[PDB]
Amino acid sequence: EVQLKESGPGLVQPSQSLSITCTVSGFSLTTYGVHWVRQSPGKGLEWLGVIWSGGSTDYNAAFISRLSISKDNSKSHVFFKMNSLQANDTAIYYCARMRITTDWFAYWGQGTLVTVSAAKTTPPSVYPLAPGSAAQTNSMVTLGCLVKGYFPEPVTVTWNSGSLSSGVHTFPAVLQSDLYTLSSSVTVPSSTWPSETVTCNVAHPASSTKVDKKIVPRD
């Protein structure tokens, strides 16, 4: 009912520009300012700038040299453009009405995850993680899948087609080189495995990859 809908790329090449459109419904751009904010693990939340009802703007001076905010009152669009992105501009970007006085239109857009990278689309390797031959047994048994060298995010991982929903930790991806890696662990009865099959199902839609990998015990 009040909505700020964001549209634009989730991937930007180093040195290229990021454009986002914020489509506003539920209040008038000719009465209320719209702000732009980003969130990154390096800097947390950072306010980038604002376009006021009259079209005047304020920018964070650390960005002023490469940032532009404009709008189209008739279409109810606010436009964000930042130039010359570098790896550390990887962040979630938001349009938002904040810093309110009289009104109750304080709402944020759903957020646009922007990754700055020259990486090419690349499917994962899926390596099974089984205990070493030596030794090593006690209840329960923890197994895993290593999902290595993919781009872009995301991948999904389920176990035995989702039967082993419980006892699973699938960890956040980290960057090594210019590609992503993560792992998923699963813990299941020592009596069950290997009498009972355990297979991880990995999906990477961006490469139309679907892989099941059975966890064989090693000898």
Binding site: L45, R99, H169
Partner: protein, 219 residues
């Protein structure tokens, strides 16, 4: 710029506890127009921040009575009187009085539980990965409390710092614990120059580290 310092960084609590979050500004934050634009946001995982408190003390649309703000000058506080499950997340303070607008570092509101040691599991590289030229040794440190934890890799007696990447989960919905992976990545060639591989976890629960390991001689 105006500096916004939140404390604590992290706050554990039981469902029904009262909580108090602090935000301190490096200067006075009264806008030229006379208003004090101190705002409080709560963010859940994978959601946009949502406004709780505006102009210091005013509750936003649909914010429960149990939430309240106060403060003046350089000192502001948010207090919750009876924390419910829906209140858990990361709290942020914001000043929109002086360009550039700025956020605090965040305060995480997480659910309290009894201590638990990490369940540590070490996994040698799969034969598949070795064929591909790489060797990732994976260690999982699963289901531990509190969050703080230290992981250390040793190869043939020597601490190994380079090639180690770590990834952490958020607090588990079902049991309220955390889980971590530590992954040591080597080339195949360097993996096969060494025999003993050790993952060592040091945690509040034990004065002795938890040590899992394997030997390649046995692989």
């Amino acid at each position: 710029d105006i500096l916004m310092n939140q404390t604590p960084l992290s706050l554990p609590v039981s469902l029904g506890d009262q909580a108090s979050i602090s935000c301190r500004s490096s200067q006075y934050i009264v806008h030229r127009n006379g208003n004090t634009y101190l705002e409080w946001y709560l963010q859940k995982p994978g959601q946009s921040p949502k406004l709780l408190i505006y102009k210091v003390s005013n509750r936003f649309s649909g914010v429960p009575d149990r939430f309240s703000g106060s403060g003046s000058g350089t000192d502001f506080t948010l207090k919750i009187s009876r924390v419910e499950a829906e209140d858990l997340g990361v709290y942020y303070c914001f000043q929109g009085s002086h360009v550039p607008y700025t956020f605090g570092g965040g305060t995480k509101l997480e659910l309290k539980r009894a201590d638990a040691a990490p369940t540590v599991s070490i996994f040698p590289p799969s034969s598949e990965q070795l064929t591909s030229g790489g060797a990732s040794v994976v260690c999982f440190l699963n289901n531990f409390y509190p969050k703080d934890i230290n992981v250390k890799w040793k190869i043939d007696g020597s601490e190994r710092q380079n090639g180690v990447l770590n990834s952490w989960t958020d607090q588990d919905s079902k049991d309220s614990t955390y889980s971590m992976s530590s992954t040591l990545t080597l080339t195949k060639d360097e993996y096969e120059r060494h025999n003993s591989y050790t993952c060592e976890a040091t945690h509040k629960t034990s004065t002795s580290p938890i040590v899992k390991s394997f030997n390649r001689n046995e692989c």
